[PDB]
Each structure stands twice: as structure tokens, then as C-alpha cells.
Tab-separated table of C-alpha atoms and ligand atoms in Angstrom:
chain	number	residue	atom	x	y	z
A	10	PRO	CA	195.774	93.856	131.663
A	11	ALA	CA	194.930	93.303	135.369
A	12	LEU	CA	195.508	89.692	134.730
A	13	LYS	CA	199.111	90.318	133.632
A	14	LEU	CA	200.211	92.498	136.248
A	15	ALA	CA	198.323	90.864	139.285
A	16	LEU	CA	200.002	87.330	138.262
A	17	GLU	CA	203.436	88.413	136.380
A	18	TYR	CA	204.430	91.076	139.101
A	19	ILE	CA	202.087	92.029	141.912
A	20	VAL	CA	201.792	88.258	143.387
A	21	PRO	CA	205.288	87.179	143.009
A	22	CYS	CA	206.368	90.533	144.320
A	23	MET	CA	204.362	90.477	147.196
A	24	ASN	CA	205.155	87.017	148.339
A	25	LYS	CA	208.875	87.800	147.893
A	26	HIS	CA	209.241	90.902	149.690
A	27	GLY	CA	205.848	91.731	151.085
A	28	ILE	CA	206.162	95.444	149.318
A	29	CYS	CA	205.181	96.102	145.424
A	30	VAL	CA	205.202	99.263	143.869
A	31	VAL	CA	203.632	99.772	140.212
A	32	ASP	CA	204.875	103.333	138.601
A	33	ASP	CA	202.635	104.822	136.351
A	34	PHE	CA	199.499	102.837	137.176
A	35	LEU	CA	196.973	104.869	135.604
A	36	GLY	CA	198.630	107.124	133.216
A	37	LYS	CA	199.437	110.959	133.309
A	38	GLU	CA	196.128	111.999	132.244
A	39	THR	CA	193.733	110.212	134.801
A	40	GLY	CA	196.385	110.692	137.464
A	41	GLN	CA	196.021	114.455	136.999
A	42	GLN	CA	192.247	114.103	136.958
A	43	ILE	CA	192.329	112.084	140.297
A	44	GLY	CA	194.920	114.927	141.852
A	45	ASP	CA	192.648	117.577	140.856
A	46	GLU	CA	189.379	116.002	142.491
A	47	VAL	CA	191.415	115.490	145.740
A	48	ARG	CA	192.974	119.118	145.552
A	49	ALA	CA	189.384	120.560	145.280
A	50	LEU	CA	188.165	118.296	148.395
A	51	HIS	CA	190.746	119.836	150.248
A	52	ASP	CA	190.379	123.533	149.311
A	53	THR	CA	186.734	123.461	149.714
A	54	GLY	CA	187.300	122.529	153.333
A	55	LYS	CA	186.673	118.719	153.335
A	56	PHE	CA	189.234	117.302	155.397
A	57	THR	CA	189.812	116.601	159.227
A	75	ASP	CA	198.017	114.381	158.381
A	76	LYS	CA	194.167	115.483	157.468
A	77	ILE	CA	192.047	112.682	156.238
A	78	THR	CA	188.730	112.269	154.068
A	79	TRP	CA	186.817	109.067	153.631
A	80	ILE	CA	185.087	108.445	150.230
A	81	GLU	CA	182.890	105.384	149.231
A	82	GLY	CA	183.400	105.973	145.282
A	83	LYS	CA	179.639	107.594	144.429
A	84	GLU	CA	179.764	110.942	146.076
A	85	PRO	CA	180.522	114.376	144.119
A	86	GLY	CA	183.651	115.509	142.888
A	87	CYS	CA	184.662	111.798	143.238
A	88	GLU	CA	184.126	110.050	139.795
A	89	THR	CA	187.638	109.300	139.189
A	90	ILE	CA	188.647	108.076	142.711
A	91	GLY	CA	185.741	105.678	141.914
A	92	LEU	CA	187.459	104.756	138.831
A	93	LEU	CA	190.503	104.406	140.943
A	94	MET	CA	188.931	101.991	143.240
A	95	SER	CA	187.402	100.035	140.322
A	96	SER	CA	191.283	99.589	138.793
A	97	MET	CA	192.384	98.552	142.267
A	98	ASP	CA	189.608	96.061	142.896
A	99	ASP	CA	190.372	94.549	139.213
A	100	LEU	CA	194.204	93.996	140.266
A	101	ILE	CA	193.379	92.443	143.523
A	102	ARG	CA	190.326	90.160	141.719
A	103	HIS	CA	192.934	88.662	139.430
A	104	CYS	CA	195.542	88.001	141.910
A	105	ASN	CA	193.235	84.897	142.443
A	106	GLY	CA	193.648	84.170	146.057
A	107	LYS	CA	197.486	83.705	145.676
A	108	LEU	CA	198.820	87.146	147.358
A	109	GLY	CA	199.893	85.672	150.563
A	110	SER	CA	197.131	83.004	150.312
A	111	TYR	CA	194.640	85.044	151.309
A	112	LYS	CA	191.518	84.921	150.300
A	113	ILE	CA	190.404	88.526	150.084
A	114	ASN	CA	186.617	89.501	150.716
A	115	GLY	CA	186.426	93.273	150.672
A	116	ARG	CA	188.062	96.577	151.430
A	117	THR	CA	187.566	99.792	153.045
A	118	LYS	CA	186.517	102.849	151.539
A	119	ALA	CA	188.900	105.253	150.161
A	120	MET	CA	190.721	107.413	152.751
A	121	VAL	CA	192.430	110.363	151.226
A	122	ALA	CA	195.273	111.843	153.207
A	123	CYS	CA	196.975	115.581	152.892
A	124	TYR	CA	200.052	116.096	154.534
A	125	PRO	CA	200.070	120.001	154.776
A	126	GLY	CA	203.717	120.859	153.845
A	127	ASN	CA	204.427	121.892	157.641
A	128	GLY	CA	207.198	119.474	158.584
A	129	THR	CA	204.659	117.152	159.823
A	130	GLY	CA	204.583	113.258	159.201
A	131	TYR	CA	203.580	110.246	160.475
A	132	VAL	CA	205.373	108.644	162.976
A	133	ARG	CA	206.482	104.712	163.086
A	134	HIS	CA	203.299	102.699	162.994
A	135	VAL	CA	201.684	99.245	162.077
A	136	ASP	CA	198.352	99.652	160.629
A	137	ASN	CA	196.624	96.566	161.602
A	138	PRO	CA	198.884	95.930	164.837
A	139	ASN	CA	195.741	94.408	166.758
A	140	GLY	CA	194.301	91.701	164.405
A	141	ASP	CA	191.866	92.852	162.279
A	142	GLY	CA	191.158	91.280	158.914
A	143	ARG	CA	192.776	94.135	157.109
A	144	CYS	CA	195.576	92.204	155.101
A	145	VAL	CA	196.944	94.335	152.302
A	146	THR	CA	197.634	98.515	151.974
A	147	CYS	CA	197.150	99.676	148.755
A	148	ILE	CA	198.319	103.251	148.388
A	149	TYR	CA	198.313	105.605	145.463
A	150	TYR	CA	200.043	108.573	145.450
A	151	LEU	CA	199.332	112.264	143.268
A	152	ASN	CA	202.350	114.184	143.980
A	153	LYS	CA	203.961	115.416	140.460
A	154	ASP	CA	207.528	116.327	140.352
A	155	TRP	CA	208.037	115.550	144.157
A	156	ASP	CA	211.571	116.832	145.185
A	157	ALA	CA	212.243	114.116	147.744
A	158	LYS	CA	215.713	115.730	148.753
A	159	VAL	CA	214.033	119.121	149.719
A	160	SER	CA	210.150	118.274	150.187
A	161	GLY	CA	210.710	115.055	152.440
A	162	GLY	CA	207.835	112.734	153.047
A	163	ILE	CA	209.128	109.611	152.301
A	164	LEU	CA	207.608	106.347	153.069
A	165	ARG	CA	210.110	104.211	154.906
A	166	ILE	CA	209.318	100.488	155.734
A	167	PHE	CA	210.995	98.248	157.709
A	168	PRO	CA	210.405	95.030	156.519
A	169	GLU	CA	210.567	92.071	158.772
A	170	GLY	CA	212.956	89.791	158.255
A	171	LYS	CA	215.482	92.339	156.312
A	172	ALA	CA	218.141	94.414	157.834
A	173	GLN	CA	217.602	97.206	155.460
A	174	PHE	CA	214.563	99.516	154.989
A	175	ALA	CA	212.952	100.631	151.863
A	176	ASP	CA	212.401	103.950	151.214
A	177	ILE	CA	209.516	104.838	148.970
A	178	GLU	CA	208.707	108.319	147.249
A	179	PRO	CA	205.294	109.532	147.160
A	180	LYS	CA	205.228	110.059	143.589
A	181	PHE	CA	202.288	110.788	140.929
A	182	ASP	CA	200.842	107.984	139.716
A	183	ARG	CA	202.494	105.268	141.999
A	184	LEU	CA	200.462	102.657	143.202
A	185	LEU	CA	202.059	100.691	146.421
A	186	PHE	CA	200.640	97.430	148.219
A	187	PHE	CA	202.297	96.069	151.510
A	188	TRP	CA	201.346	93.604	154.129
A	189	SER	CA	198.918	95.376	156.985
A	190	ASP	CA	200.267	93.718	159.766
A	191	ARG	CA	203.511	93.499	161.855
A	192	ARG	CA	205.373	92.274	159.082
A	193	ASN	CA	205.505	96.118	157.753
A	194	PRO	CA	206.174	98.723	160.331
A	195	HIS	CA	206.346	102.079	158.480
A	196	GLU	CA	206.484	105.851	159.005
A	197	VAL	CA	206.126	109.040	156.648
A	198	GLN	CA	209.148	110.985	157.208
A	199	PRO	CA	208.251	115.035	157.636
A	200	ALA	CA	206.882	116.771	154.725
A	201	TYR	CA	207.764	120.377	153.660
A	202	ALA	CA	205.647	120.623	150.666
A	203	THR	CA	201.741	119.562	150.358
A	204	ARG	CA	201.543	115.637	150.084
A	205	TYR	CA	198.401	113.820	149.124
A	206	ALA	CA	197.662	109.851	149.107
A	207	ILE	CA	194.848	107.757	148.694
A	208	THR	CA	194.839	104.369	150.849
A	209	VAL	CA	192.809	101.525	150.827
A	210	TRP	CA	192.795	98.483	152.954
A	211	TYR	CA	191.880	94.868	151.795
A	212	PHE	CA	190.558	92.304	154.187
A	213	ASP	CA	190.685	88.663	154.277
B	301	KU1	O1	201.287	107.970	153.019
B	301	KU1	C1	201.898	106.886	153.036
B	301	KU1	O2	202.998	107.003	152.256
B	301	KU1	C2	202.082	106.262	154.115
B	301	KU1	N1	200.583	106.722	155.406
B	301	KU1	C3	200.423	105.785	156.666
B	301	KU1	O3	201.425	104.789	156.757
B	301	KU1	C4	199.134	106.313	157.156
B	301	KU1	N2	198.973	105.232	157.870
B	301	KU1	N3	197.676	105.097	158.494
B	301	KU1	C5	197.007	106.291	158.543
B	301	KU1	C6	196.022	106.294	159.176
B	301	KU1	C7	194.915	107.418	159.377
B	301	KU1	C8	195.615	108.413	158.909
B	301	KU1	C9	196.433	108.485	158.032
B	301	KU1	C10	197.701	107.385	157.879
B	301	KU1	C11	198.561	107.503	156.925
B	301	KU1	O4	199.000	108.347	156.319
B	302	FE2	FE1	200.356	103.465	157.541
């Protein structure tokens, strides 16, 4: 399954566009589970835009580990073909919560200063996101296109994009609680 998705979709889509959306990545059950785990971290005080870092062995986080393992399976089966990068690892999972008070994240590049992070991978957990009323769109400005790309933070959506200056991006103001989990893979 990872072989097929990696080589029939993620590799070609990324090499062409530098951005790749995989809807329905883990399915509604496992999704909801990860979502219930992120919410339990949050409501029990464990955020510090607020964030918390997770390795994947800590408590209340088993299924976030399964997510990370599932992401890793995709990247491993890209076979060094994704942007001709030989990927050597990734960060821990960064869980982010925009509380829903109009806050967002201003336009930025993830790796502006030349660290080894090459691919940003984000998994979204927001069921029945009403983007027209709730805001919180991810807007990416891919270098070499005169049109931006708008990505809704939809439940069980996995997203890949190049981390460097090819992809300046912003989280537009969010008016409902918005959750996402990011890892960065490095070459
Ligand atoms: O959630 C999204 O759709 C995109 N989100 C981001 O680009 C983003 N990028 N870099 C960060 C660094 C530290 C803390 C939060 C973030 C963050 O949400
Ligand atoms: Fe970012």
C-alpha cells in the first residue's frame, strides 16, 4: 500500500508541484482516535498558535506513534526519488492548536536558513471543517506559479510540501479550534 501510494502519487506529484495532498490517509476510525488523543493532551494543560512535541512512546500518544510510523513507511518507499533527496530522518511530531480566536500564523518559510529539513508533512484532524465560516486555510505560494494554493485543514488529510523557500506559506486566521500534527524530514 505504501509502495503504491509513494511511487504512483507522492513522488510524481511532489516532483511536479512541490505540494501533495493525500485525503483519507488513515481512515475515519484511526483518525478520530488520533484526534481524541490530541484533544486530551490539550485539555490536560500540555501545550505552550500553541504546540507540544511528541516522540511517539509517551502516554496518551500510541496512535500518534502509528501515524508517525505510517508517514515513515511512505517516505521510506519513496526510494530516494522525492526531489532526489536521500532522506535520513525526521523530527519528532509537533502538535499544533490554533484556539479559534482569530489567530493564525503569518507567511513564513519553514527552513529559511539552510538546515537539512527538506519535506514538511502535516496531518490534519478537524472534522466537518467549515472553511467559509471557520477560516484557518493553509495558503502556499509555490515558487514559479503565479497562483497560490489553498489547502483546507480537513480531517484525515495528509499533506507534503518542500520546506525551503520554494514554499512560503501562511495559516489564515482561524475562528474555530484547529489541530494539526507536523513532522519535518531531513536529508
Ligand atoms: O498548520 C498548518 O496548516 C501550517 N502550519 C505551519 O505552517 C506552521 N509552520 N511552522 C510552525 C512552527 C512552529 C509552530 C507552529 C508552526 C505552524 O503551524
Ligand atoms: Fe510552516
